[PDB]
Amino acid sequence: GFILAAMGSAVGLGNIWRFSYVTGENGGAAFLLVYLGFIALIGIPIVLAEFTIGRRAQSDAVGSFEKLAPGKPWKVAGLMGVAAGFLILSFYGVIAGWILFYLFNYITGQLWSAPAEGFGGFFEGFIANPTLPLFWQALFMIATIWIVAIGVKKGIERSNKILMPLLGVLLIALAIYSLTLGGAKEGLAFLFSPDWSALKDPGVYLAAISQAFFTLSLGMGALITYGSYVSKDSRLPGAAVSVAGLDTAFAIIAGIMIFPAVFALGLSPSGGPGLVFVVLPDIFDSIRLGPIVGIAFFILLGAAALSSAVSLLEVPVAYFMRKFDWSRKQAAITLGVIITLLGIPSSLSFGVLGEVTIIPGLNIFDSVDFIASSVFLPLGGMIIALFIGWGWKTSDALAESDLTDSVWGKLWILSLRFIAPIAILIVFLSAFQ
């Protein structure tokens, strides 16, 4: 039921866009290994943790901590999630803006054939433009603010009820097609033959733990909100697995679509954020009716991004209504404008503001992404796990998580109580050296 809504949030640009350029510049299979290891040992338990919290509390993220734990400082994760909601959405609307621009050019037929400067140069010229991405960012943000304020979200999960299975099938089709382009052995080995020297590098673990929290909509309390509006019929840990498995499925299939085509096109896997925006247009170009494939793919991906951005904007909006007694439309608009303003310099980091560094060695886009995804999400996720692991009580924890008198229940508690917090902790200390 409402578990589909959680998948609507989980599956988005993190599965196709982010997963690609993070996996690419981090070795590939070695990264993927750690990534898959984190979803299992850290991801799924914490996803189940957020479901458990919301379902008992029957409230929003930050409100859940106060109801379950009045006055206790456990709510610092919820507050940290609010800040992450601002940061992540700020640049998320920028990448989603890129999708709408690419959608437009397939509608006008400008991307049907390769431009004079090539698809790479086309994307370069677009993001180097100071004001052209800003329009499409605003256009996407306005649509997000619109849906959140009006509260019309059944336009959204009737969408991910049809459009998301369509996205999955399309990706499966494109993944198979990409393997025929002549870079299959190079692509699969990159993705599934681990380089053990990369496991020497602590930064790989931090990138994997970041992608894990990002792709699962985890660490900021977005899933806590979904869990509150889940009836008690529903076995939560099956939901947590199904959510994690489906999202993992979307990402891995996307990798099989991208990287074989990357080596086929003779591109670098460490290309950057615009990797997919260079590969896909040429794949579609190799297809005779590829413009139609292109139009369909960016309509579907845009839908997935929209349903994820609504999920993102909801976290600060729901908070500001609980704390400052704002109306839904007021909160959505005000925060919407602020977040969009916050996204402008981030979008300019691909152009005239490329020289600016905030985090040492990282531009504005990478800095915001770092602070939100590599710091806030796993730190907040740690606190959430610690909350159930130590702050809760096993009897209540297992009761809500539908894992009473089970071996999985003890295994789940063990994850949240030690294995997950220590793993995130170890990654932190090793990375910050």
Ligand X SMILES: CCCCCCC/C=C\CCCCCC(=O)OC[C@H](O)CO
Q: Which of 12, 54, 343, 381 binds ligand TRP (CB under 6 A)?
A: 12
* Min dist. Cβ of residue 196 to Na ion (A): 27
Map the footprint of ligand X across residues 113-152, applying CB under 6 A.
131-132, 134-135, 138-139
The one of ligand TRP, ligand X, ligand 78M, none whose footprint includes residue 13, by CB under 5 to 8 A per kind, is ligand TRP
Nearest to 5 by CA among 312, 308, 231: 308
How does DSSP classify residue 393?
Answer: -
Cα–Cα distance list, 404 to 170, 211, 230, 240, 243 (Å): 40, 31, 19, 16, 21
Letters for 364-403 (x = contact with ligand TRP by CB under 6 A, - = none) are -------------x--------------------------
Cα gap 410→414, rounded to integer Å: 6
* Min dist. Cβ of residue 297 to ligand 78M (A): 9
Binding site for ligand 78M (CB under 6 A): 169, 173, 176-177, 180-181, 287-289, 292-293, 296
Q: Which of 159, 248, 308, 340 binds Na ion (CB under 5 A)?
A: 308
Who's near 180: CB < 8 A, 6+ residues apart?
none
* Min dist. Cβ of residue 410 to ligand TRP (A): 28
Q: Which stretch binds ligand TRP (CB under 6 A): 170-178, 194-202, 260-268, 307-315?
A: 307-315
Identify whether the C-beta of residue 112 lies closer than 8 Å to the C-beta of residue 322: no
Q: Which stretch binds Na ion (CB under 5 A): 3-11, 27-35, 51-59, 332-340?
A: 3-11
* Min dist. Cβ of residue 213 to ligand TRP (A): 6
Q: Which stretch binds ligand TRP (CB under 6 A): 264-272, 275-283, 304-312, 417-425?
A: 304-312
User: With binding defined as CB under 5 A, does residue 54 bind Na ion?
Assistant: no
Identify whether the C-beta of residue 177 lies closer than 8 Å to the C-beta of residue 293: no
User: With binding defined as CB under 6 A, does residue 353 bind ligand X?
Assistant: no
Q: Which stretch binds ligand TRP (CB under 6 A): 213-221, 288-296, 338-346, 381-389?
A: 213-221
Who's near 275: CB < 8 A, 6+ residues apart?
20, 21, 24, 258, 262, 267, 269
User: With binding defined as CB under 6 A, does residue 321 bind ligand X?
Assistant: no
- Location of structure tokens 């993927």: 32
Identify whether the C-beta of residue 317 lies closer than 8 Å to the C-beta of residue 148: yes
Instruction: Tell me what percent of the chain is helix, strand and coil, each rounded to the nearest 5.
Output: 80, 0, 20
CA 206 to chain centre: 15
Nearest to 301 by CA among 178, 166, 148: 166
Beta bridge partners of 363: 357
The one of Na ion, ligand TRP, ligand 78M, none whose footprint includes residue 292, by CB under 5 to 8 A per kind, is ligand 78M
Chain contacts with Na ion (rule: CB under 5 A): 10, 12, 14-15, 215, 247, 304, 307-308
Chain contacts with ligand X (rule: CB under 6 A): 131-132, 134-135, 138-139
